Design an enzyme around this catalytic site. Structure first.
Site, mmCIF file in Angstrom:
data_model
loop_
_atom_site.group_PDB
_atom_site.id
_atom_site.type_symbol
_atom_site.label_atom_id
_atom_site.label_comp_id
_atom_site.label_asym_id
_atom_site.label_seq_id
_atom_site.Cartn_x
_atom_site.Cartn_y
_atom_site.Cartn_z
ATOM 1 C CG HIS A 256 8.544 -1.322 -11.767
ATOM 2 N ND1 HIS A 256 7.312 -0.711 -11.755
ATOM 3 C CD2 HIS A 256 8.339 -2.592 -11.341
ATOM 4 C CE1 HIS A 256 6.410 -1.556 -11.282
ATOM 5 N NE2 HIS A 256 7.007 -2.705 -11.031
ATOM 6 C CG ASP B 177 7.257 -2.768 -19.976
ATOM 7 O OD1 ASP B 177 6.489 -3.547 -19.373
ATOM 8 O OD2 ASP B 177 8.444 -2.601 -19.631
#
EC number: 3.2.1.52
Length: 343
Positions: A193, A268
């Site tokens: 992330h 993702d």
């Protein structure tokens, strides 16, 4: 203005313009009722994401109209609902509940199937069609780490038993379960992330992280989410979600001891995660993941959609992406969505 149809999935492509075919392959996070209604009406996206910043009053009547107006098949509605630390709908479906790690330690496999089915039932009444869960990552890292207590265990057999039960629970309730993050985030070098992440070598994965998939990919319906993971021996310095070599392994299965997989494959989050956004802008990332063989390109905001569709139409005319690849994914998503009511 895309009208509903009773055509079978394999035939759905014949009904659509090239732009609308491309739009079917996009799933985007939304701010609120207005944002969601506008992106569906104006760009005909295949689905939306109930993301971290989504106003949950969207469930109070807005959603059913928004879904009713889309075509030619029902709008997909997705959410991150794992339980514990990742539970977007905690306020609505009875709280966070325990983490995955806590579940596997304190309840039986059947009790876990019970809980997944109940939570899934409540999610389906709200309008949810897709849940990005279960996590099948294998790790013994600390609770609060990026995977941490989001994992059902540090042993593959344990994960197969408990993640398998969770997926079946959701499936019991009519919600699509999605295994994540292929081909294994549990022993990654960091957090996807906010940076680039590398896995252990492919040979290590095949005997450990990939073992749950050998049996779980055969229990339909099920989707697979591919992580932003660099894999030595498979992808080089490219994240798996943007790597045709990684998706092709999933498709063929042979190389890690699995049957082939022809279900829906998701990237993702392409926008909100630095592992991608450090190197690619959104419309380039979307092109790459569809080039890799993903069926659904996922990210968390709507504003990029007009630019993304323009770039994808460019790729079609310049031969960067062949129509056979778009059509094949459109058929997979029709199959995932199922038939219209009334047919």
């Amino acid at each position: 203005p895309v009208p509903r149809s009773c055509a079978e999935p394999a035939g759905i492509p014949a009904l659509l313009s090239p732009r609308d075919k491309l739009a079917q392959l996009l799933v985007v996070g939304v701010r609120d009722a207005a944002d969601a209604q506008a992106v569906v009406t104006n760009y005909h996206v295949g689905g939306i994401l109930i993301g971290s910043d989504t106003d949950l009053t969207i469930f109070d009547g807005a959603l059913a109209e928004i879904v009713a107006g889309g075509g030619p098949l029902p709008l997909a509605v997705s959410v991150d609902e794992e339980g514990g630390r990742v539970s977007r709908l905690r306020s609505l479906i009875g709280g966070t509940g325990p983490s995955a790690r806590e579940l596997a330690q304190t309840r039986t496999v059947q009790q876990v199937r019970d809980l997944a089915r109940d939570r899934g039932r409540q999610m389906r009444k709200l309008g949810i069609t897709i849940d990005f869960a279960p996590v099948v990552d294998v790790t013994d890292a600390p609770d609060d780490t990026v995977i941490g207590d989001r994992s059902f265990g540090s042993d593959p057999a344990t994960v197969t038993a408990y993640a398998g039960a969770y997926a079946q629970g959701l499936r019991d309730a009519g919600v699509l379960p999605v295994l994540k993050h292929f081909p294994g985030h549990g022993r990654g070098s960091g957090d996807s992330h906010n940076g680039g992440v590398t896995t252990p070598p492919l040979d290590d994965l095949v005997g450990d992280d990939l073992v749950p998939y050998r049996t779980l990919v055969t229990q339909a319906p099920v989707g697979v989410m591919v992580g932003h993971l660099q894999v030595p021996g498979l992808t080089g310095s490219e994240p798996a979600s943007l790597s045709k070599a990684a998706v092709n392994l999933l498709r063929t299965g042979t190389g890690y001891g699995a049957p082939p997989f022809d279900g829906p494959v998701f990237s993702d989050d392409l926008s909100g995660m630095a592992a991608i956004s450090d190197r690619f802008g959104v419309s380039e990332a979307v092109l790459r993941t569809l080039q890799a063989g993903a069926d659904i390109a996922l990210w968390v905001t709507t504003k990029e959609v007009p630019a993304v569709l323009d770039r994808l139409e460019q790729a079609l005319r310049a031969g960067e992406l062949p129509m056979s690849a778009v059509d094949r994914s459109v058929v997979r998503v029709a199959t995932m969505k199922g038939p219209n009511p009334g047919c």
